[PDB]
Design a protein around this nucleic acid. Sequence first.
DNA 1: CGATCGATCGATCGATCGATCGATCGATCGATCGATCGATCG
Length: 96
Amino acid sequence: FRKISRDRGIIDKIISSMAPSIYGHRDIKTAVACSLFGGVPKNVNGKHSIRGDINVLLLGDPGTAKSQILKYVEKTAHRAVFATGQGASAVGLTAS
DNA sequence: CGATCGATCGATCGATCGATCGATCGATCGATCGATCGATCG
Ligand SMILES: Nc1ncnc2c1ncn2[C@@H]1O[C@H](COP(=O)(O)OP(=O)(O)O)[C@@H](O)[C@H]1O
């Protein structure tokens, strides 16, 4: 890990390795890459907290593999939970 | 060992408000037709 961490173009190797069999859409691939690594959460005592999670919205015309990206994120991420807008319910998301 | 209310969440129907659309009343300028007339030369 330390060896690759200091290699040339480490950020470009990461982004170009997001979804290898998807062409272009590099502004999404860089957005997918950043959402996987995430930020650093902060909690100031006696004040409110700050989230470190990165939120991505993929809006596009039919095609463009928006769904296949979420299928690639499901397998690569450590703990991935997949949901669908119509197949989910208010109880099925919050609690039972 | 059996009979009677209770709470929950999915599934279905339906009724109510709203998005969508064809129609008419009021208007008007684009296109045209004719009259007016000032200008030109035999
Ligand atoms: N930019 C792209 N490059 C390569 N293949 C693509 C691309 N966009 C779509 N595809 C092909 O289309 C399919 C994705 O379709 P789909 O997930 O239904 O897109 P969406 O859900 O965003 O409409 C994949 O199997 C993929 O092979």
